[PDB]
Symmetry: C3
Subunit: 273 residues, 3 copies
């Protein structure tokens, strides 16, 4: 009769439900055992003013200007003048060596991503014994946060431990298109990291040869796009979602139990007749 067909259908449905809940529980198990982080992108009209920690050493900051889409031709390269930016100077011991102190010049970065706001910095280093002409730069977010920070020393070391340190060369103009990545760790601590795309442009010096010994450093800092990349694992960042998933698994188990009970009742009814 159709009774055995209904019993088989309900048994198959119970098997389906228990398989589904077991698969969900399993996938939750690999999600917990293998911590994997999801990636998303957030669009924002205006970026928070970042901090650029430059390490000139003996190089002198000739100029620092804010421009929009265009850097006008230099009136006289190698000549200081027209410093229009908020800069700070900090001394902190290196978190790794603990013997050498790194004197950092913090510069407020560009803010208007949609208008391609450019921070153009000009350095001049007359003489050095270093084999390679470079200036180190470390990108951190929220220059105001550093300025408002109490110690201003441990913050710089914590930013040093972050993976946002690069170097730009002398004798070249370095167009840096930086992008922001915010990671929510397992501990919940926010990690701020920077990607960059670099355009290196050769600089042709028309100055008299007598002054050509000095090295000129040009760097242009710019936001690549109004897209902040957020990296976080959904299972760990949201305990409420984990509880919701467990609750849904429990509900699925209960629906499977209800289907099994209906199957048992139908089997009893069939056996009675």
């Amino acid at each position: 009769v159709f009774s055995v067909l209904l019993i088989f259908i309900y048994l198959l449905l119970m098997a389906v439900a228990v398989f589904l809940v077991y698969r969900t529980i399993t996938d939750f198990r690999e999600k917990l055992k293998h911590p994997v982080m999801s990636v998303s992108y957030k669009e924002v009209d205006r970026y928070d003013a970042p901090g650029i920690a430059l390490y000139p050493g003996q190089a002198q900051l000739l100029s620092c200007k804010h421009h929009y889409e265009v850097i006008p031709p230099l009136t006289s390269p190698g000549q200081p003048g027209d410093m229009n930016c908020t800069t700070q100077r900090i001394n902190y011991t290196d978190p790794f060596s603990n013997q050498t102190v790194k004197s950092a010049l913090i510069v407020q970065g560009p803010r208007e991503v949609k208008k391609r706001e450019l921070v153009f910095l000009q350095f001049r280093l007359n003489k050095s014994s270093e084999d390679f002409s470079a200036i180190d730069y470390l990108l951190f977010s929220s220059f105001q946060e550093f300025l408002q920070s109490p110690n201003r020393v441990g913050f710089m070391q914590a930013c040093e431990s972050a993976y946002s340190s690069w170097k730009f060369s002398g004798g070249f103009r370095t167009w840096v298109k930086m992008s922001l990545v915010k990671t929510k760790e397992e501990d919940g601590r926010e990690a701020v990291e920077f990607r960059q795309e670099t355009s290196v442009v050769n600089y042709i010096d028309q100055r008299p040869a007598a002054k050509k010994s000095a090295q000129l450093f040009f760097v242009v800092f710019e936001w690549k796009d109004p897209f902040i990349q957020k990296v976080q694992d959904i299972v760990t960042a949201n305990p409420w979602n984990t509880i919701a998933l467990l609750c849904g698994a429990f509900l699925a188990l209960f629906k499977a139990a209800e289907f099994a009970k209906l199957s048992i009742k139908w089997m009893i009814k069939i056996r009675k007749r």
Copy 2:
């Protein structure tokens, strides 16, 4: 008796169901209030022929060739010849300054990603007063779309507003590995953006010194990988999925109501006895 146990179990299950539906509704609320975009990757056998908007200014395009994995040694650098590409020339006023017109040379980009198709371009600029030797380049997709565009002026300005503008230096060969990102905005408008990885190679000039005043620009355009990155928020891009989520929440609320009704019936049955 077991009646009170069953009543407690059903009450707990109703609490679980209402908590689950409330959590889903809440998470939907933060998804709407905080527009966050998901990221996916699409593999395609052959890329659409892109457009490269070069801005030489006074520089003369000596050569433009399509190669496969290998650029043969130059027969004679600094000498024009063997132009084998589809190029266009467009004049459009700059969307920002509105005083300076940007004359752009559009070049069809590489197509075969799986064979590492290379577009090699050679420019020669004999003399200029600019301090920095650079040529600007803007990457947009579907060069055919520009060619088929009616105005060819507003399209160039719209591409200018996009964040895919870089500069390559003279005296160097610039291997550009470009990658395509397609974003579906809140308005639904498609935004085409380009990432790049740049390899700068110094160029050693063995030409006679008398001709060394001229600047040589070499650029190689190549697709990095057959992976187009699509950025879109699932909640907004799919209104059908939003309606489905709301419908599922309503179904969960109804199942909670059914569980509560079963609990009430069991309580009434227990009270009767």
Copy 3:
């Protein structure tokens, strides 16, 4: 009476359930028809020792050292000495031309991402007829896997087909911050690909002019961040999840059928009275 209201409510609920299951089936259809890959990030304490396939040609590897955060000043540039790395030399025919054999020098890469382990390599090429001074480098993962590979020839060709080949220039120090992307293809084959961020630093040669004809190549290999990017489509990589989705759709269809049956029973009860 309220009977018609209940019948309408149940009919609407059945419509909701069938709409939800139809939407799920549809979205599954576009997921299958349009293969789209999800992106995730995995944090690991220590990276697997990668392989760097250098192609010096006639260039002589002067030096290869492992450093931590700092490269000490060079005692004497252009002078060989202090080779401390595990290197291998392999000859394999190019997978594309099949006429030219590419002699590759495989170097073990950095391992400690959290301490910024640096692999610093120094080459010296006294004379060449090539117009552009460059050395090609191909990044693959698990240098041990290559070392343990039986053929060591087909593996190099397979890595050549991968999109992780770049070039670093002579007369410059190239800080390479490499990042690892692992893709699970439709066939299930693992594809290992590398992104990089390049910092090019000009090298000032204080050596006597008589030896300045020789070209010096400096490269620094470093891991950008302890974040491996995994690209895989969930629907295809997990057949169990696909079966679970189909089973859930079947359960939704059955719940819709149950709601319709309850509606029919209520309608019959209303018609009886």
